[PDB]
Design a protein around this ligand. Structure first.
Ligand SMILES: Cc1cc(/N=N/c2cc(S(=O)(=O)O)c(C)cc2C)c(N)cc1O
Length: 121
């Protein structure tokens, strides 16, 4: 639950650590919304979102990839939450809204995932 055997775990152990970090992202107010849910480039009015981003990811797809077993390693998810944060940071460039949403999330996230990555690492 903090440090014992080899790093690599089961997506379940992960969730135990990771998910909580997610819920923290999820609890970051609408700042989370654009991630805890698929951007839906049709819903928001983006026809080329996947032309700006190469890997959009969404805490929905992440916490699901988390609830499905697509990590097997906590970092896997991390790259994905940093993914959705990265594409929000590149898509909206800077001085936007989701840039702010992604900023604090990266904060709580590193406030969760750091303690996570250490609980797992
Ligand atoms: C990529 C992008 C996304 C944007 N908004 N996204 C969302 C907005 C809302 S909300 O209804 O306004 O709260 C919700 C729930 C979810 C999302 C994903 C946006 N405004 C500009 C953008 O360039």
């Amino acid at each position: 639950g903090s440090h014992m055997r080899k790093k690599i775990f089961k997506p379940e152990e992960l969730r135990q650590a990771l998910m909580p970090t997610l819920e923290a992202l999820y609890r970051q107010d609408p700042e989370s919304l654009p991630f805890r849910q698929p951007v839906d480039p049709q819903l928001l009015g983006i026809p080329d979102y996947f032309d700006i981003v190469k890997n959009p990811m969404d805490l929905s797809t992440i916490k699901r990839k988390l609830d499905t077993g697509q990590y097997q390693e906590p970092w896997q998810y991390v790259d994905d939450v940093w993914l959705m944060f990265n594409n929000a940071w590149l898509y909206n460039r800077k001085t936007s809204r989701v840039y702010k949403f992604c900023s604090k999330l990266a904060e709580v996230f590193e406030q969760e995932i750091d303690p996570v990555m250490q609980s797992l690492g």
